[PDB]
Symmetry: D2
Subunit: 298 residues, 4 copies
């Protein structure tokens, strides 16, 4: 039925009508959609890509130096094949940007990301609004829902990785859905290795240049009372290309209260986003009582 | 009201009547009780203590060697105050003893623990039976309940630690109850630093020589439909003495099905012990559906 | 001038004369040589390859399970691209085989490696003898030199790795020579990614099927008073193939005394192999005196 | 013969004569000396102590939270006796203060340390000058010797630790000398647990309130051509008191060139301080050639 690839700028022209419905359709039947002409200068994306990869290589050169020294201590000879090429770090943008405080980063690099973080936040809120429109909600409803008190939690995960040694290794690998609100993914190359589960079958995200892959989390499923479901996915390092990935998450504020939009209404539960994340980090059952309640439910 | 200290061998004499009731009382109003004349030769306990501490010192000497080498690599000077004196490892006894396969242990040491593991299993099952008797259940009911299919999970946690640098550090330290069945704790010296919460207040476990501190877990609370509750506790390294601790856990088998004894009957839930431990290791919510159910409950 | 690829079985025929000289030439002008028809049943190699890769995949499946759980704790979502695909463990064969005690290994796997370890030890000693012959030394001279008192240290490093994310990352990566005696390397596929430095330039080891790449360490350079020099190398995971590697090291015994064969004689130093390895693990300068001597030398 | 305890302010009075000679004597026959009335306001020391301990407790509360969560994942119950109470971090002051960039520190705390770092640098340079005077060198000779090009390396190691579980554990624990220039140690309580080796026997550093323990490194031994030797020491956490320690090191600049003062002149070697530290971090023998030279020396 074809993965929805969408040109954002068309929501400013005569085709808006058709474009707005690709979004609606993608939202209800895919949980994902790939964006192009999304507004982020191909200039900025390239600069973000070149600088990220640079920081990475510097970390790796330093990582091998340490590896050799550490291995020697144990009378072992460190080879390059002993290297751990995986490296990931996060950047908080909202409600508080720790970008100025993240370790070993160039100031020119910090400013690039400071700006990218701002452009993505803007793109995130436009998409949220276009969703409201397709949903029949007032403008900024979702942005408001996510506000809580201090505002929404926007951050970026920056990963660098080698390819998976052999595809068969990704066999029993569990899949999942994102617990947050809306996710904006930016990758290098054309082929990500990202796949979503549609109708019990795995579907590849079409390789596009300078695209931003967008996907909905569990919070939007609750807020839409099921209209838009969060889909299961997995990214698998392709010997092909994609070896860098910047996954930015735009989630509700810690204290935000999630519940199906009254107008959008079985019914979904109401709750503080934070309880949902604690139900996640298993911090909800270190107590006897809850456990006894959990078992009583089943 | 005084912490119950009990002499096990008295269940073989005229005083059995009174001793059996200290157990009943301890079970319903303390969740804990300290044992003496429990049947384990003061000989065996001492030998277990001397050998454990020996293994520990050897590990520590090796740990400092590594520390100096590791620190030097970073152009740092390792001092003895940089040492990590905490060391803990487990030994599985039932249903399968990995004692013959636990790393860096003397064979003479492995056999001491093999024997101690057997004596404790025996002590564990006698206590379970005395509990049945006080509970009005048939002999071996609890042992049977814990059997599952392959049998109960009996293992020993062996810890060695320095004292807490300053008591005030143990301020906001969360307390807890044991999720398993019955716990048998063996320590060195006289003062453990172990405390239980009785009536909103912290109570110290009386310092006894060669005692075995016994405490009930959540599983026995379920099986007894509340008659015996699992109490909250914490052990705090005393500058005083106790620096070694062997906590042996006698828990239901993985697949065992727990539920209030029909004769012992709000009502407690029925369930596989394994689901309870997964509800523990937070492996129960990596899926969207469950999360939505959890939030719906609250 | 072409990398020396050699067929061992020809040392049993009329061509022995020419084969023996490929070895001589490889020993003096390459420090490396690739072996085929070396005596290890293509059967054994394949079985060793299939079982190693199997153990690896099992470890990886378990590693991702842990990754997801660990990441969730920090409210992070573990993706497959977050995986660390590198895994290496050692097996001691001589003078004492810990193969029966290496963690999480199939017994059928342990026996395969027990046998492979024996075949390689045999191949290692034949090569040592052929070297003696080309060197003009008595048979078993080198094997004897390596004996020390308890015998030589033979072990196997078993590594599994993904490919290097991008070749340019292997830029400033230091190269090195092996400090031991003789090294026997067995890999999967055809292309290893292994390179040696010949005349200031990097040379690839020819891709061969079921070959055993052999290379000399510093100890043989000393023993030969320079006749045979230990060459600098590096292995770089190829997107191509090689993703498994079993590097077996046949080094002198701990207490062995190394020195240029009297008949093979600037002159090389005499010393206990162990001091050489401690000069390696930097355990030789944690003392003031030595440091002052070291600086005085320079 | 009594450990030299010295009152610095007396170098400003009639007793200067006698005080200056306690320093001379301490320098030649102890390698250590304890300071009081050293110029750092008892006010500043207390504030530095109260704030350090506060940061520590916060880290520990957070460390136990993580411990419980991590242990639960493995179906293990984290007890307080499982805690790792040791925590150490460094602060660079010279030539570049990373104090403004050290993680999780209060700004009020960063400023306290910024000021303490300045007071200690001043105390460090006065002592260096008093040493010059006793040595017959011009004022600032040593400070100059340590300057290199960018200046000397001054930093502070901040450690917090529990007491050693049992004194006997500190048996075979290697001792050492400091490779740097001059060390200024500040501790809490009265009893440090610090000992120096004098005449083959261990000597305790006298417990003093608000003292600064000063000790000379290998660099000053070189610069003095043996006149002042760097002594072997070790600090052992006392169940008694000292549980906090701030060891500030005032070492020569990276590129500084060390050698016996011409006027102070077997003879000691000349060298760049950095080569001495690399001879330390074993980064000097990952190359074959050097190794062969090292073995040739012995």
């Amino acid at each position: 039925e074809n993965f929805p690839i969408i040109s954002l700028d068309k929501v400013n022209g005569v085709e808006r009508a058709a474009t707005m419905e690709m979004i609606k359709d993608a939202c209800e039947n895919w949980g994902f959609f790939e964006l192009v002409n999304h507004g982020i200068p191909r200039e900025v994306m390239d600069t973000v890509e070149k600088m990220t990869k640079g920081h990475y290589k510097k970390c790796m050169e330093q990582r091998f130096k340490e590896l050799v020294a550490s291995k020697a201590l144990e009378g072992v000879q460190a080879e390059v094949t002993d290297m751990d090429w995986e490296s990931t770090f996060f950047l908080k943008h909202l409600p508080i940007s720790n970008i100025s405080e993240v370790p070993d980063l160039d100031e020119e690099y910090r400013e690039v990301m400071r700006d990218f973080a701002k452009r993505l936040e803007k793109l995130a809120e436009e998409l949220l609004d276009l969703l409201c429109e397709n949903l029949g909600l007032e403008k900024g409803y979702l942005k408001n829902a996510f506000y809580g008190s201090k505002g929404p939690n926007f951050g970026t995960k920056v990963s660098n990785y080698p390819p998976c040694p052999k595809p068969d290794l990704i066999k029993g690998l569990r899949a999942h859905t994102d617990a947050g609100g809306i996710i904006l993914l930016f990758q290098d190359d054309k082929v990500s290795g990202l796949q979503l589960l549609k109708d019990g079958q795995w579907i590849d995200v079409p390789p596009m240049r300078h695209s931003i892959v967008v996907n909905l989390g569990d919070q939007l499923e609750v807020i839409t009372n099921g209209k838009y479901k969060s889909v299961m996915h997995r990214v698998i390092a392709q010997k092909d290309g994609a070896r860098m990935s910047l996954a930015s998450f735009y989630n509700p504020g810690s204290d935000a209260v999630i519940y199906p939009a009254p107008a959008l209404v079985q019914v979904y539960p109401k709750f503080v986003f934070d309880d949902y994340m604690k139900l996640y980090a298993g911090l909800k059952f270190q107590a006897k009582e809850p456990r006894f309640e959990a078992m009583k439910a089943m």
